[PDB]
């Protein structure tokens, strides 16, 4: 079983989150109490909607399974973390399965087996979904302090709109009976009936759904009561608070039309289509963003961005990209001004504000992998790793970046890859290529691009001179300097998504509370611990 706390990457309707296992077990559990059956000491429960990664227990590639159910067992016994040579660690219980070696073969090696020294399965890449994502800033702002959006407001041109509101209202009314048929009433049953709440007659109509017709009314009902009138520029406005329990019930169709920021400032289009340059901008956010609020006159509240750098080629490259989504903005000595309040919204609940807590978009990583790359882009060249002497070193403060980023890594091919946390720090290291990086694998390869000499020992009975990399490997074979039949007991490891970390140190102690486990639809396993590690479930 695994312990509570490990980090575990899960799919949720096709988005990747990053969860302590214990916290997803017990959630769910609680939210289902009913279902939850229960022999003793073991809990039980079947879920649907849950997608974690494995890999092919055959050809061994990734490939995303089903989780069929979430297993709680209340433990008293001895739990093992252990340590990779790469920087993985993973804490389980004494009988739980992770992978080893023998014979060239990937076999099992429960927890209290494992020692220093053991070869363990990890992954060389992963194969998410691929999709286009799109943000909804009304959404992002209704997971937001209603303290933090005093000043925001969605206005809309009165051009084909004259007195929409009052006058859909009244048409709504009229329809649950509770005033004469309104002028314009034909106006609005056709725009109800493409919205789909209703189906017109030739002679009248027919209610579809009346619970959805209930909250669009309210939603009306909201605007009449807020929504001014702005004779300077023509348009209607209302205050996002204003409407906070209501908006989110506006239909998309009708969302497009809106606007979303200051009265005096930016405006925003409400819906954006995820592209490489938003993915790459955010990516300079992540790594070099600062987002502040400072009092200025009457003491309390001009908010801002900046995005630091002390090389003019990128400053130029961020002001572009910021400029893009957020026009005017404002060039600095070392870094890049967008002093609006919504990008600022955006910014914060997309990235986060303190260092200890930035993360990567969840949109990000599903996404086609040019912007997966993008993102990688404007993090990589914002903190500075574009010009390597040797492997990289990410830093930062916040864990859940660091699990992030080798997950995104991973899906993009790089499998190099490793890590530490040394004063308050994590870093991540790599050394690979990247297609905005060159970084020589061959200089000071990593385990992933290795394949261990006991492994070639054992599989070929010869003894080797010293680790061969699978580049070296599959040449070895088409010149008979390894037996291709032999060499066939491999195929899984140099064909398959899975490579060979190595234990480090192996602590034991004594353990007194609840573990978990899940259960895979046909792999039998997953990822879990920090940097991620295959084990079977």
Excluded at 108 to 131: I, M, S, W
Excluded at 201 to 218: A, F, H, P, Q, T
Excluded at 295 to 317: A, M, Q, T
Excluded at 444 to 455: C, D, G, L, M, R
């Amino acid at each position: 079983s695994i312990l509570p706390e490990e980090w575990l990457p899960v799919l949720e309707e096709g988005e990747v989150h990053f969860v302590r296992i214990g916290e997803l077990i017990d959630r769910m559990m609680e939210e289902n109490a009913g279902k939850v059956k229960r022999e003793g000491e073991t809990e039980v429960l079947e879920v649907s909607g849950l997608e974690v990664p494995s890999f092919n227990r055959r050809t061994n590639k990734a490939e995303l399974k089903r989780v069929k159910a979430l297993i709680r067992h209340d433990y008293s016994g001895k739990v093992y973390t252990i340590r990779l040579k790469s920087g993985r660690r993973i804490k389980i219980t004494s009988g739980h399965s992770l992978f080893s070696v023998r014979n060239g073969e990937l076999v099992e090696v429960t927890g209290d087996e494992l020692k220093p020294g053991d070869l363990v399965a990890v992954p060389r890449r992963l194969e998410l979904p691929e999709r286009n994502h799109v943000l909804n800033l009304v959404e992002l702002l209704l997971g937001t302090p209603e303290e933090e959006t005093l000043d925001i407001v969605m206005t809309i041109p009165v051009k084909g709109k004259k007195n929409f509101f009052k006058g859909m209202l009244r048409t709504l009314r009229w329809i649950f009976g509770e005033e004469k048929r309104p002028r314009t009433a034909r106006r609005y049953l056709r725009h109800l009936e493409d919205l789909g709440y209703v189906r017109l007659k030739k002679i009248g109509y027919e209610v579809l759904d009346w619970d959805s017709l209930k909250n669009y009314r309210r939603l009306y009902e909201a605007l009449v009561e807020n929504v001014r009138y702005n004779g300077n520029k023509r348009e209607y406005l209302v205050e996002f608070n204003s409407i906070r329990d209501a908006v989110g019930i506006m239909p998309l169709k009708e969302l497009k039309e809106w606007k979303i920021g200051t009265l005096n400032g930016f405006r925003m289009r409400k819906l954006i289509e995820v592209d490489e340059s938003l993915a790459k901008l955010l990516g300079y956010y992540v790594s070099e963003g600062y987002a502040r609020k400072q009092r200025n006159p009457k003491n309390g509240w001009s908010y801002s961005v900046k995005l630091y750098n002390e090389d003019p080629e990128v400053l130029d490259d961020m002001e572009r990209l910021a400029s893009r989504f957020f026009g005017k903005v404002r060039r600095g000595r070392n870094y890049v001004e967008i002093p609006k309040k919504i990008g600022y919204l955006l910014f914060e609940n997309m990235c986060g504000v303190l260092a200890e807590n930035k993360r990567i978009p969840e949109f990000v990583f599903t996404s086609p992998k040019g912007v997966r790359l993008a993102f990688l882009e404007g993090y990589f060249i914002g903190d500075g790793d574009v010009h390597p002497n040797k492997r990289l070193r990410l830093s930062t403060k916040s864990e859940l970046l660091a699990n992030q980023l080798v997950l995104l890594l991973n899906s993009v091919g790089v499998s190099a890859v490793k890590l530490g946390h040394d004063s308050g720090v994590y870093r991540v290291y790599i050394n690979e290529e990247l297609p905005f990086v060159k970084l020589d694998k061959k200089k000071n390869a990593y385990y992933s691009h290795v394949i261990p000499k006991e492994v070639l020992s054992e599989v070929f009975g010869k003894v080797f001179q010293k680790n061969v990399s699978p580049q070296t490997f599959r040449k070895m074979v088409e010149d008979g300097r390894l037996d291709p039949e032999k060499a066939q007991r491999l195929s899984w490891l140099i064909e398959g998504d899975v490579v060979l970390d190595r234990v480090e140190s192996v602590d034991v102690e004594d353990y007194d509370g609840y573990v978990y486990d899940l259960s895979v639809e046909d792999n039998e396993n997953f990822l879990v611990g920090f940097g991620l590690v295959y084990a079977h479930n």
